[PDB]
Design a protein around this ligand. Sequence first.
Ligand code: NAG
Ligand code: NAG
Lengths: 96, 96
Amino acid sequence: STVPQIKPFYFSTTLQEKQREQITCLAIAGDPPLSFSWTKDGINIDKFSDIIVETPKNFYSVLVILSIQPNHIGNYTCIVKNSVGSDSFTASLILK
Amino acid sequence: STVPQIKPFYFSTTLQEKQREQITCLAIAGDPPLSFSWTKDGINIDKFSDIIVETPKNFYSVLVILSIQPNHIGNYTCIVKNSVGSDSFTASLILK
Ligand SMILES: *[C@@H]1O[C@H](CO)[C@@H](O)[C@H](O)[C@H]1NC(C)=O
Ligand SMILES: *[C@@H]1O[C@H](CO)[C@@H](O)[C@H](O)[C@H]1NC(C)=O
């Protein structure tokens, strides 16, 4: 009865290489079952083997990078879907 | 030789009752092993039956609220520790 709704997530503004990073695509509202999916620059997050993606609970999914390095720059987009609707959010990983 | 450093976390600005919430205390920098602790309004998070606290990986801790109620208002503090230093961050939960 409730359309999914994603809490905004961000990468660190002071990101430096070899640091660790985590973002959570949290569905603050939305009736389960919910389907989470990730893309980086329009590419399936599959193709980036340095990135770990999990769905530990049925209402959020987590993206983790153990050692940030130049190839991780891009726009990371998460999409959540259910019976009644969808939602999406994008965050940009930048390296100064 | 690297002291812990927490990546900032925030609760939703548009929080409403019975919604779900998650915050991650990520040690963006710091040598393992890392020890995570939580307090709400200075009280051990142990005492709050309706709050789930886990350490899914050894470099970030997760605080999860399945259904938000008025009791959950307060300032939540994470404290990370290792051999050579510690860090702290506080995010406050508001119900408009
Ligand atoms: C996508 O990412 C590129 C580089 O990562 C950035 O310059 C651009 O502003 C982003 N586009 C959108 C629509 O967010
Ligand atoms: C913590 O929240 C209390 C109200 O519960 C308030 O008095 C105090 O100013 C807050 N602390 C900070 C640092 O905002």
